[PDB]
Design a protein around this motif. Sequence first.
Motif, PDB file in Angstrom:
ATOM      1  N   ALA A  71      -4.034   7.102   9.008  1.00 24.54           N
ATOM      2  CA  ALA A  71      -4.627   6.987   7.685  1.00 24.54           C
ATOM      3  C   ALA A  71      -5.674   5.884   7.565  1.00 24.54           C
ATOM      4  CB  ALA A  71      -3.519   6.783   6.649  1.00 24.54           C
ATOM      5  N   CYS A  72      -5.313   4.642   7.921  1.00 20.52           N
ATOM      6  CA  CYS A  72      -5.996   3.427   7.464  1.00 20.52           C
ATOM      7  C   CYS A  72      -5.745   3.297   5.960  1.00 20.52           C
ATOM      8  CB  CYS A  72      -7.493   3.440   7.813  1.00 20.52           C
ATOM      9  SG  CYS A  72      -8.361   1.828   7.845  1.00 20.52           S
ATOM     10  N   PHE A  73      -6.700   2.712   5.208  1.00 17.63           N
ATOM     11  CA  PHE A  73      -6.767   2.486   3.750  1.00 17.63           C
ATOM     12  C   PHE A  73      -6.957   1.001   3.443  1.00 17.63           C
ATOM     13  CE2 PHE A  73      -3.892   6.389   2.839  1.00 17.63           C
ATOM     14  CZ  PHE A  73      -4.960   7.228   3.065  1.00 17.63           C
ATOM     15  N   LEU A  74      -7.916   0.681   2.572  1.00 25.16           N
ATOM     16  CA  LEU A  74      -8.271  -0.690   2.212  1.00 25.16           C
ATOM     17  C   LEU A  74      -8.054  -0.881   0.716  1.00 25.16           C
ATOM     18  CD1 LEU A  74      -9.391  -0.715   5.087  1.00 25.16           C
ATOM     19  CD2 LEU A  74     -11.670  -1.187   4.157  1.00 25.16           C
ATOM     20  N   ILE A  75      -7.298  -1.920   0.336  1.00 24.06           N
ATOM     21  CA  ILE A  75      -6.904  -2.122  -1.058  1.00 24.06           C
ATOM     22  C   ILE A  75      -7.075  -3.586  -1.456  1.00 24.06           C
ATOM     23  CG2 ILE A  75      -5.146  -1.582  -2.802  1.00 24.06           C
ATOM     24  CD1 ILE A  75      -3.900   0.362  -0.991  1.00 24.06           C
ATOM     25  N   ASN A  76      -7.349  -3.802  -2.745  1.00 25.38           N
ATOM     26  CA  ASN A  76      -7.544  -5.145  -3.296  1.00 25.38           C
ATOM     27  C   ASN A  76      -6.207  -5.809  -3.620  1.00 25.38           C
ATOM     28  OD1 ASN A  76      -8.537  -7.455  -4.514  1.00 25.38           O
ATOM     29  ND2 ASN A  76      -9.373  -6.408  -6.317  1.00 25.38           N
ATOM     30  N   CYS A  77      -5.505  -5.281  -4.625  1.00 29.22           N
ATOM     31  CA  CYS A  77      -4.231  -5.828  -5.100  1.00 29.22           C
ATOM     32  C   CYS A  77      -4.378  -7.270  -5.588  1.00 29.22           C
ATOM     33  CB  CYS A  77      -3.135  -5.710  -4.035  1.00 29.22           C
ATOM     34  SG  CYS A  77      -2.055  -4.282  -4.318  1.00 29.22           S
ATOM     35  N   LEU A  78      -5.486  -7.542  -6.280  1.00 27.82           N
ATOM     36  CA  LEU A  78      -5.700  -8.814  -6.975  1.00 27.82           C
ATOM     37  C   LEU A  78      -6.429  -8.512  -8.285  1.00 27.82           C
ATOM     38  CD1 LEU A  78      -6.640 -11.391  -4.195  1.00 27.82           C
ATOM     39  CD2 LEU A  78      -4.479 -11.143  -5.400  1.00 27.82           C
ATOM     40  N   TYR A  79      -5.657  -8.260  -9.345  1.00 27.37           N
ATOM     41  CA  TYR A  79      -6.290  -8.082 -10.646  1.00 27.37           C
ATOM     42  C   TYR A  79      -6.750  -9.453 -11.147  1.00 27.37           C
ATOM     43  CZ  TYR A  79      -7.248  -6.564 -15.408  1.00 27.37           C
ATOM     44  OH  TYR A  79      -7.872  -6.284 -16.599  1.00 27.37           O
ATOM     45  N   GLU A  80      -7.778 -10.002 -10.496  1.00 26.77           N
ATOM     46  CA  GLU A  80      -8.365 -11.290 -10.849  1.00 26.77           C
ATOM     47  C   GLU A  80      -7.317 -12.398 -10.785  1.00 26.77           C
ATOM     48  OE1 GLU A  80     -12.171 -10.803 -11.754  1.00 26.77           O
ATOM     49  OE2 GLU A  80     -11.100  -9.560 -10.290  1.00 26.77           O
ATOM     50  N   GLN A  81      -7.076 -12.902  -9.570  1.00 25.81           N
ATOM     51  CA  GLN A  81      -6.132 -13.993  -9.299  1.00 25.81           C
ATOM     52  C   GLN A  81      -4.689 -13.614  -9.652  1.00 25.81           C
ATOM     53  OE1 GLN A  81      -7.543 -18.159 -10.208  1.00 25.81           O
ATOM     54  NE2 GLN A  81      -9.249 -17.081 -11.196  1.00 25.81           N
ATOM     55  N   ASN A  82      -4.247 -12.445  -9.185  1.00 22.94           N
ATOM     56  CA  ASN A  82      -2.875 -12.020  -9.446  1.00 22.94           C
ATOM     57  C   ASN A  82      -2.423 -11.011  -8.400  1.00 22.94           C
ATOM     58  OD1 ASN A  82      -1.640 -13.377 -11.718  1.00 22.94           O
ATOM     59  ND2 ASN A  82      -3.133 -12.355 -13.053  1.00 22.94           N
ATOM     60  N   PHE A  83      -1.242 -11.248  -7.836  1.00 21.93           N
ATOM     61  CA  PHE A  83      -0.578 -10.301  -6.943  1.00 21.93           C
ATOM     62  C   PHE A  83       0.022  -9.186  -7.791  1.00 21.93           C
ATOM     63  CE2 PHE A  83       0.712 -10.221  -2.424  1.00 21.93           C
ATOM     64  CZ  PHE A  83       1.426  -9.038  -2.441  1.00 21.93           C
ATOM     65  N   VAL A  84      -0.655  -8.038  -7.823  1.00 20.96           N
ATOM     66  CA  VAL A  84      -0.224  -6.897  -8.627  1.00 20.96           C
ATOM     67  C   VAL A  84       0.334  -5.760  -7.789  1.00 20.96           C
ATOM     68  CG1 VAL A  84      -1.712  -7.402 -10.590  1.00 20.96           C
ATOM     69  CG2 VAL A  84      -2.591  -6.048  -8.680  1.00 20.96           C
ATOM     70  N   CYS A  85       0.296  -5.869  -6.461  1.00 15.51           N
ATOM     71  CA  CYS A  85       0.944  -4.891  -5.597  1.00 15.51           C
ATOM     72  C   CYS A  85       2.410  -4.720  -5.976  1.00 15.51           C
ATOM     73  CB  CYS A  85       0.845  -5.329  -4.134  1.00 15.51           C
ATOM     74  SG  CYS A  85      -0.464  -4.598  -3.108  1.00 15.51           S
ATOM     75  N   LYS A  86       2.919  -3.505  -5.782  1.00 15.74           N
ATOM     76  CA  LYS A  86       4.331  -3.207  -5.993  1.00 15.74           C
ATOM     77  C   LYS A  86       4.763  -2.252  -4.893  1.00 15.74           C
ATOM     78  CE  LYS A  86       8.027  -0.848  -7.708  1.00 15.74           C
ATOM     79  NZ  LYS A  86       7.919  -0.166  -9.032  1.00 15.74           N
ATOM     80  N   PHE A  87       5.781  -2.643  -4.136  1.00 13.69           N
ATOM     81  CA  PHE A  87       6.175  -1.935  -2.928  1.00 13.69           C
ATOM     82  C   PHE A  87       7.471  -1.166  -3.151  1.00 13.69           C
ATOM     83  CE2 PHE A  87       3.601  -5.439  -1.122  1.00 13.69           C
ATOM     84  CZ  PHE A  87       2.682  -4.682  -0.429  1.00 13.69           C
ATOM     85  N   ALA A  88       7.681  -0.140  -2.323  1.00 11.01           N
ATOM     86  CA  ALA A  88       8.883   0.686  -2.393  1.00 11.01           C
ATOM     87  C   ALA A  88       9.190   1.302  -1.030  1.00 11.01           C
ATOM     88  CB  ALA A  88       8.717   1.781  -3.450  1.00 11.01           C
ATOM     89  N   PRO A  89      10.388   1.091  -0.485  1.00  2.00           N
ATOM     90  CA  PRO A  89      10.675   1.553   0.883  1.00  2.00           C
ATOM     91  C   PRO A  89      10.748   3.069   1.021  1.00  2.00           C
ATOM     92  CG  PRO A  89      12.550   0.357  -0.116  1.00  2.00           C
ATOM     93  CD  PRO A  89      11.367   0.106  -0.971  1.00  2.00           C
ATOM     94  N   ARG A  90      10.323   3.562   2.191  1.00  2.00           N
ATOM     95  CA  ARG A  90      10.716   4.905   2.608  1.00  2.00           C
ATOM     96  C   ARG A  90      10.790   5.028   4.134  1.00  2.00           C
ATOM     97  NH1 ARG A  90       7.050   9.291   4.613  1.00  2.00           N
ATOM     98  NH2 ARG A  90       5.184   9.471   3.348  1.00  2.00           N
TER      99      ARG A  90
END
Length: 320
Positions: A71-90
């Motif tokens: 796949a790859c894939f490039l993501i920001n996950c910084l809504y202006e100085q904030n860790f907004v990522c949310k993870f979930a196992p599979r």
Amino acid sequence: PAGADCLNSFTAGVPGFVLDTNASVSNGATFLESPTVRRGWDCVRACCTTQNCNLALVELQPDRGEDAIAACFLINCLYEQNFVCKFAPREGFINYLTREVYRSYRQLRTWAGIDLKVQPQEPLVLKDVENTDWRLLRGDTDVRVERKDPNQVELWGLKEGTYLFQLTVDTANVTVTVLSTKQTEDYCLASNKVGRCRGSFPRWYYDPTEQICKSFVYGGCLGNKNNYLREEECILACRGVQGPSAACEKYTSGFDELQRIHFPSDKGHCVDLPDTGLCKESIPRWYYNPFSEHCARFTYGGCYGNKNNFEEEQQCLESC
């Protein structure tokens, strides 16, 4: 081998989880490119070179080896100085952060740094935060931080630029961004952008035609700079703004494999860190912290939290 150092700045992340997307972007995670390189450690050297890439995800294409990346894939996950990522196992998903960011190893587990984009003015007032003692850190001119009541800091001496502060009583690295006119057209004057992605996201945007912030649907990607997760952030960016309805820097451009998928994510959630919110009241609620596996109470503003926001002792332990 790699020929380039870069590689070292990313930690080699564990398998199992993968970021929630439907919610991660619903928190503000800017989505970028989706490159097509067939080694994963090739895909990170493609994330060093990106202006806002901080998360480097890869599928694994199950079974057929490890470094035949899927796949790859490039993501920001910084809504202006904030860790907004949310993870979930599979399963066979392995993710790559950047030590920088990776304030998820901070934030573990203790109103962080806000990024206020405001219009050029002189008598500014905003979210109170009681007590006081405000500490400068950047200013073209000195700033008159004079305070009245009911707790409401006022910031004179503000002209266009960027200012960083410190809310010493308990501190907060918080920055005001008095936008230039170059930033006004993009954040406040540019008409909106639904985008090519098939989405369902809540966002806000400013209309200079009637001096108004209205609400619209975000497709998910390539959205214009006039785009706000909260209407409060919308108005703060604008108003006092009039106007009518490769040489840039970045975007739009998508021909065409910038089209994403929705993974499985079982159900249970739960386990997100607590979010007090952006509101006012003191509402006691209960959440489930998984470091100790039992519930705890906290004061909720009344708006915008995480899925881990039950109400009683047994309602919280019931669903985690």
